[PDB]
Design a protein around this nucleic acid. Structure first.
Lengths: 121, 233, 56, 251
RNA sequence: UUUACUUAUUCAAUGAAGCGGAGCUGGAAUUCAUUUUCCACGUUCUAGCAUUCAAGGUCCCAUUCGGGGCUGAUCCGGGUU
RNA sequence: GCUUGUGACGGCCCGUGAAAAUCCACAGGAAGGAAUAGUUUUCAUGCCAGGUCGUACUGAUAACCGCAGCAGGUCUCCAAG
RNA sequence: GAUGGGGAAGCUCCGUUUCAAAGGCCUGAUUUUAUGCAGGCCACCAUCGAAAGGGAAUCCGGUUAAGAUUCCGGAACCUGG
């Protein structure tokens, strides 16, 4: 009989049915626990003389954070651990291969009464 | 009625960007399409040997069904029925104590190129069905040759997929009967006679006839112009 | 600057006339003139050539 | 010894062509279907200079015969072609300069440039400034055309080969002495690095066949055979005669 | 020595688009009954425009809001040239 | 006046002096729409977020390269009377 | 500089659109609903390659022992939603 009309001078690969995967078994049989926890993003504070001057003056918290963290994790982690709101986060990798974070709280919170709550002052 | 006007456009060389047409002639097919298309092109521009061109001549449409009504009655037993007989045959052994002779003779279409060649050599064949579509042709080029020298009538019939379902397989490339029920010799005898006049009786002519050699439309038309132009006198 | 044409309103980037923000006032006039004269010349050639063939 | 300068050119490392500012591949239009039976009209948008050659190029614009598209062509401008002209490309196109016509469909004695020598090459011989082709005689049956090349050669090519009627713009570009080393510096800053040329006789024997010796001289014949190999072919290749050109071409 | 074919092999082009044969309408031919052709069979004063399965004609549907078939745009051969 | 930016011109070339991402405009008319009610987010105002790595210092008759805290070498910006 | 391929005994060489079935965006249809299914459009074509090329948008004042067009105060603009 008559063939199908093909207006083009080309012939391309037809679209086939592409199934998904759910083969028989899990890749590792145990999904990994959270690698970068809220307790691993933030290790410890910086209580240096320069850092402490910042605390009472600029409503800033100076923290030593994980090298693998970013500013979203730092903002969320400070909220979880300390029940305080972060206004901004500044990061710098220190010349000893570690990350320092300048965590500024909103005017609702004062870092003076929070720094000694942690136990360093 | 009056708001609709008549545009009709002019699709010639210079105006009216062309309409969509069927360019099926002008499709560059994948390489696998071209190679199989040029597979049969090259096979008919060449002088195919005389021991071939026994093929490309096949049992006609009229006698295809009549040949295939007879073979289809004696279909080889399927797996489902074979499960039924053995549990019945084993049961007949238990109390009937028959020496594996509970069921009667099986009547089925024979096949298999190693099987059929032995049947032809032992004169145990009376009609052979052969497929023309063997991709390696050497498997069958001798089959019309065995059948004549022994004296067996054969029918080169179209289709492995149709000789396949007769065997409940995909391809068989061969099919035959060697012993038939008493009520089908009347049908078999005249069926054998028909294929004789096509394949058996005409074999000693096709032993000297070549095939292919046909040219393309653009090249067959060329000789037509050349001959008739020179035909003027 | 080319990126700054995205934050600017439409009235700063085109003029009212046809082919407004793209073509000149006189160039738009030129193709206005040219289009009319030879869409009227074509229907003059169309009737002229049909007269010549009809005579024969 | 050492491989010589004409041997080092085939590595194509620093002896390539300079092609940053070259406009494009200045070819003819394609022979799809609308020229073999009719014509198609085109417009010249701009005629521009080409870095590397001394002949201007034209931007000829055509309408796509199969899509709502405005496919544009890069031709070598004929002297006389002007911006805003109309260009006709087909078999029945008139005999006017700027039109693209086949050799078998133009009268004997026609001036044609940008001429394919196999139908469909989109461009071939008579490309350089002030160069053209002339038809000598057609052979209608077993269709062929006899033409003369800018070198003065007679070449027979397929009757359906194409070519723009007229002569390439920019004729006489070489009648002006450069007068200066640095003028040749800019001529070849954009062509290729085949300038300047240390003489081979002003060399050392390791660096050239002609180098060495207490005086600057060739030593042996500078006329070199065809069968000579890479390294031996420096001088006057395959020369039939030499000296000063006394007499006519005698072709 | 000359010469002939295309499918092998070799060369070049395009997103493999108009190839081959024949057919509907004819400027110029002698038909010596009945037609044989070169081929004719949409574009050239002009730097505009040409895209929406093409508008029109026609046959259906289940009305609609519209949808489909043919034609407009000759047929055949799948050999991209 | 000095330095620097910019404009309109002129001279010069067998030299005529990059590419893309991106951004806008135009032609075109698919579709969507109005009355007791619709539409525009190329108008204005109002809301949220903007990750990663770098950032100190010298840049040279002492932080660079010359066996060194070496009369050598090492690209560039600003330039008072 | 992968790929499709072609060489090379071979480590590897050619070659970047090449004799590839080479790819993905808008809108629908159902709101058992995932996107199967209505459709049309698209033919370019891996990627790497410039802290002096191209390029969205931040300024002033103050502040340290040592940092700021990055902190602080004020006042802005851009992109995305």
């Amino acid at each position: 009989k008559a063939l199908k009309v093909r207006t083009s001078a080309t012939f391309r690969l037809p679209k086939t049915l592409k199934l998904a995967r759910a083969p028989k078994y899990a890749s590792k049989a145990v999904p990994h626990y959270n690698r970068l926890d809220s307790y691993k993003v933030i290790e410890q504070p910086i209580t240096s003389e320069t850092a402490m001057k910042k605390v009472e003056d600029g409503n800033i918290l100076v923290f030593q954070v994980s090298m693998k963290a970013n500013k979203y994790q730092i903002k969320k982690a400070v909220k979880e651990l300390y029940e305080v709101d972060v206004l901004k986060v500044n990061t710098l990798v220190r010349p000893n291969g570690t990350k320092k974070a300048y965590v500024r709280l909103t005017a609702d919170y004062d870092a003076l009464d929070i720094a000694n709550r942690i136990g360093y002052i | 009625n009056p708001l609709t006007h008549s545009t009709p456009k002019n699709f010639g060389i210079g105006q009216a960007v062309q309409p969509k047409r069927n360019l099926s002639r002008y499709v560059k097919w994948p390489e696998y399409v071209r190679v199989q298309r040029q597979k049969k092109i090259l096979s008919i521009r060449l002088k195919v040997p005389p021991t071939i061109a026994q093929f490309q001549y096949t049992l006609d449409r009229n006698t295809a069904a009549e040949t295939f009504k007879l073979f289809n009655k004696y279909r080889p037993e399927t797996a489902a029925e074979k499960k039924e007989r053995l549990t019945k045959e084993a049961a007949a052994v238990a109390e009937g104590k028959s020496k594996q002779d509970a069921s009667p003779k099986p009547y089925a279409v024979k096949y298999g190129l190693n099987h059929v060649v032995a049947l032809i050599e032992n004169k145990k064949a009376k009609l052979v069905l052969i497929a023309n579509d063997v991709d390696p042709i050497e498997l069958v080029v001798f089959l019309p040759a065995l059948c004549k020298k022994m004296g067996v009538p054969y029918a080169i019939v179209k289709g492995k997929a149709r000789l396949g379902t007769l065997v409940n397989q995909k391809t068989s490339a061969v099919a035959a009967l060697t012993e038939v029920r008493a009520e089908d010799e009347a049908a078999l005898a005249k069926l054998v006679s028909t294929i004789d006049a096509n394949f058996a009786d005409k074999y000693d002519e096709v032993k000297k006839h070549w095939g292919g050699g046909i040219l393309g439309n653009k090249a067959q038309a060329k000789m037509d112009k050349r001959a008739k132009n020179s035909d003027s006198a | 600057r080319p990126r700054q044409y995205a934050t600017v309103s439409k009235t700063h980037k085109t003029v009212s006339r046809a082919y407004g923000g793209s073509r000149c006032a006189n160039c738009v006039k030129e193709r206005i003139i040219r289009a009319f004269l030879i869409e009227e010349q074509k229907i003059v050639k169309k009737v002229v050539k049909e007269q010549t063939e009809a005579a024969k | 010894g050492r491989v010589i300068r004409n041997q080092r050119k085939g590595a194509g490392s620093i002896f390539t062509s300079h092609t940053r500012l070259r406009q494009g591949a200045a070819k003819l239009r394609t022979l799809d279907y609308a020229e073999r039976h009719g014509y198609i009209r085109g417009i010249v948008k701009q005629i521009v200079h080409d870095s590397g050659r001394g002949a201007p190029l034209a931007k000829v614009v055509f309408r796509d015969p199969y899509k709502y598209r405005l496919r544009e062509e890069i031709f070598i401008a004929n002297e006389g072609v002007h911006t805003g002209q109309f260009i006709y490309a087909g078999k029945k196109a008139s005999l006017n300069v700027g039109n693209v016509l086949p050799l078998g469909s133009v009268p004997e004695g026609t001036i044609v440039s940008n001429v394919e020598e196999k139908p469909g090459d989109r461009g071939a011989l008579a490309r350089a400034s002030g160069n053209y082709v002339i038809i000598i005689g057609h052979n209608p049956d077993e269709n062929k055309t006899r033409v003369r090349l800018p070198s003065g050669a007679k070449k027979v090519i397929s009757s359906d080969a194409r070519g723009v009627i007229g002569v390439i713009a920019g004729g006489g570009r070489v009648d002006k002495p450069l007068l200066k080393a640095g003028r040749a510096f800019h001529k070849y800053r954009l062509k290729r690095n085949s300038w300047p040329k240390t003489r081979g006789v002003a060399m050392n024997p390791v660096d050239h066949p002609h180098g060495g010796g207490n005086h600057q001289h060739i030593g042996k014949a500078s006329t070199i055979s065809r069968g000579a190999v890479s390294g031996q072919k420096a001088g006057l290749i395959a020369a039939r005669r030499t000296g000063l050109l006394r007499g006519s071409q005698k072709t």
